[PDB]
């Protein structure tokens, strides 16, 4: 499809950044999670970054760790996430849906088979957290074969070769982990989105101010889920209170 292009063309012509919330699928339950994601969308999330619970999330803090164990306690499997994903795309035809995966869940039953499954349910992009561009060739080929954008992190310690490789290999959007925003607009690189420490409206604003095309709240939306496990109804309202405020800061 063409979902990431059209989103960035609309937010540009609206003079607003992209707000992309992260949330792990099935946190804390399946039908509970679906209502969370609907509520993030209702309050104006421009796209979604969605995690699949993995056994050993060696690149994730304790908030997402317990987010994962919450879903495993719910009995959430990769198979169940893809049934969620098909249900979310069927409700929301235009919103870009991006996955944040661990390499083993992509590699497990066949790399091409995973990305084929992504296209089948309407996923737009996949960032594999523990696959650097040096190891990415079979992943980004399977991605591009199935009309999935491969996302790559542009780390703070990025050298110039990395910058060009990320510009060349990456589609959809660039995940910024001043000088770097310079050099990705350099080489026809997908729009950069800041993801380091966005848990306030006041850090979204600043990220849009520095020239990025958006910001990703890599967690503390999952802190909202954690803070209100026993209070489902209050969890939803408190979630909208957040994302509305953060999306209000996007402009």
């Amino acid at each position: 499809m063409e979902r990431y292009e059209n989103l960035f063309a609309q937010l540009n012509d609206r003079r607003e950044g992209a707000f992309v919330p992260f949330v792990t699928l099935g946190d804390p339950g399946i039908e509970q999670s679906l209502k969370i994601i609907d509520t993030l969308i209702d309050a104006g999330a421009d796209a979604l970054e969605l995690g699949v619970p993995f056994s050993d999330p060696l690149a994730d803090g304790p908030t997402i760790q317990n987010a994962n164990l919450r879903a495993f306690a719910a009995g959430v499997t990769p198979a169940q996430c893809f049934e969620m994903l098909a249900l979310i795309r069927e409700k929301h035809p235009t919103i870009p849906i991006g996955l944040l995966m661990y390499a083993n869940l992509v590699f497990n039953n066949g790399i091409d088979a995973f990305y084929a499954r992504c296209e089948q349910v309407g996923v737009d992009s996949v960032l594999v957290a523990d696959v650097p561009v040096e190891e990415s060739a079979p992943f980004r080929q399977a991605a591009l074969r199935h009309n999935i954008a491969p996302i790559f992190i542009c780390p703070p310690n990025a050298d110039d070769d990395l910058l060009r490789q990320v510009a060349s290999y990456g589609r959809g959007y660039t995940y910024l982990l001043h000088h770097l925003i310079e050099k990705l607009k350099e080489y026809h690189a997908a729009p950069a989105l800041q993801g380091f420490g966005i848990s306030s409206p006041e850090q979204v604003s600043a990220a849009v101010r520095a020239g990025a095309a958006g910001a990703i709240s890599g967690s503390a939306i999952v802190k909202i889920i954690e803070k209100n496990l026993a209070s489902p109804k209050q969890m939803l309202a408190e979630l909208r209170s957040f994302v509305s405020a953060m999306k209000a800061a996007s402009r």
Partner: peptide, 9 residues
């Protein structure tokens, strides 16, 4: 080397 990009340096 299946690490996040941040650790490759």
């Amino acid at each position: 080397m299946y690490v996040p990009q941040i650790l490759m340096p």
